[PDB]
């Protein structure tokens, strides 16, 4: 269990993804 469980967020705010491409897949602009 490593490499960023985004499942433990309710959603992920696009605001803390930086350039992380996997982050930018799930995230949500606000």
């Amino acid at each position, epitope marked *: *269990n*490593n*490499d*960023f*469980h985004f499942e*433990v*967020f*309710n*959603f*992920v*705010p696009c*605001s*803390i*993804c*930086s*350039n*992380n491409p996997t*982050c930018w897949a799930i995230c949500k602009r*606000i």
Partner: antibody
Amino acid sequence: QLQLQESGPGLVKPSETLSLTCTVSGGSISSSNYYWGWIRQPPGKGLEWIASIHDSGSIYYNPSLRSRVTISVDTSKNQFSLKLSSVTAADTAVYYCARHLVWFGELRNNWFDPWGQGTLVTVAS
Amino acid sequence: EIVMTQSPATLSVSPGERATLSCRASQSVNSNLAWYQHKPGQAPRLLIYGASTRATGIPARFSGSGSGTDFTLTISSLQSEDFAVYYCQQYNNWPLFGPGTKVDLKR
């Protein structure tokens, strides 16, 4: 300078809910790219993180506690709160509020800086 | 499931020498590791993040080294002020802390 102050009941009866509030001062919670969280330490056990909340309403959970945690932010009074349901003696602890730096950039950011001074909760019949 | 251990649980150290101190992780955590200082009755304080990076406001006597499974926090020229418990925290997936190690002073 940024400061966090917990406030909440010293005592809560088992099978009921514990609620705490952190009042941040010397900095504003909104707008801000920082999550705001709670960590707890039972007597003679380690630290365990609980949940954090971002101005945007995103909530970062410890999964082992997620089912029991409600965490909210009142951006105007500069206050985030924790509610923990159906408490047991397993929940007696010092509860700290903290600023949670989350970042998924180049160099990850997943820590707490700085903290409040803790408040002792006791779950007692 | 990750699991953080620290050793030794407790450590007595002459005022002035170096206290070398460790954190270990079951699986690997790259360099997603912080260290906190917690003097009793006071608030925890972030010492190092990045597994090597000293947080702003922290003396150069406290340095972190290590990676994957083995980390080490060392306090050179230990002061009496430094007496407290030190926790490590991995952030590979989410925040998990170690049991902590109590640093006592000798005199």
